[PDB]
């Protein structure tokens, strides 16, 4: 580990600096080093980990989609042959994306999930596992594609089961998990009705619990509820 000689606290400090500087690759490398110290992560630290890799993979996904679109157009009737370069470069970006996903999944498996006993931490990590298998599924076309989709589904489902038992319906982690699992249903599993049902039920159950919340918690929960509504509007 390149970060093996740096103090845990220094890695966390530098991850925060990297965030401020919009240096997300560095942020992710610092947080990987912090995870590899072997200690559990606090709430704030889990968030730094997730933000770093979300931004790295998000950029890769956006690039992959641009390149995939160019490649699709090149294979249309009447398109002039331009050689192997578009496919090669799309493949390069894809391989790098898969590498990042494998790295995140590796951190979760060694050993974040197994040491997470509180509902909030376990759900957070299982959501991440679902998300990164979902990103692998976005680019999958071979014989393991079904197994990748099922891996995402299984992680999301375990997270959902815990969240429903252990967390209030307004809890932000619970809400964000549901938002993302609903997108999984719509975009990956070809289950738009399940996606819509999950988003609606999640929204409605959260609405009914808002009365219990402080002003600050209300703000957080309603922001995420609006994302559920936005997706519902897109889909209906």
């Amino acid at each position: 580990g390149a970060m093996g000689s740096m103090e845990r606290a220094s890695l966390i400090q530098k991850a925060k600096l990297a965030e401020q500087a919009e240096r997300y690759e560095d942020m992710a490398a610092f947080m990987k080093g912090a995870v590899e110290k072997g200690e559990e992560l606090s709430c704030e630290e889990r968030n730094l980990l997730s933000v770093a890799y979300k931004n790295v993979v998000g950029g890769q996904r956006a690039a992959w989609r641009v390149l995939s679109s160019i490649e699709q157009k090149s294979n249309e009737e009447g398109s002039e042959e331009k050689g192997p370069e578009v496919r090669e470069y799309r493949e390069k970006v894809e391989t790098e994306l898969q590498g990042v996903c494998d790295t995140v999944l590796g951190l979760l498996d060694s050993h974040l999930i197994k040491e997470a006993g509180d509902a909030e931490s376990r759900v957070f990590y299982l959501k991440m596992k679902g998300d990164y298998y979902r990103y692998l599924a976005e680019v999958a076309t071979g014989d393991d594609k079904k197994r990748i989709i099922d891996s995402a589904r299984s992680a999301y489902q375990e997270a959902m089961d815990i969240s429903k038992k252990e967390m209030p319906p307004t809890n932000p982690i619970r809400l964000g998990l549901a938002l993302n699992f609903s997108v999984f249903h719509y975009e990956i599993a070809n289950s738009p009705e399940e996606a819509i049902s999950l988003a609606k039920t999640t929204f409605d159950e959260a609405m009914a619990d808002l009365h219990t919340l402080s002003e600050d918690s209300y703000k957080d929960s309603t922001l995420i509820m609006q994302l559920l509504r936005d997706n519902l509007t897109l889909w209906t």
């Binding site: 938002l179 997108v183 995420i224 994302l227 936005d230 997706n231």
Partner: peptide, 5 residues
């Protein structure tokens, strides 16, 4: 694309 967090 739809919203995720």
């Amino acid at each position: 694309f739809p919203a995720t967090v």
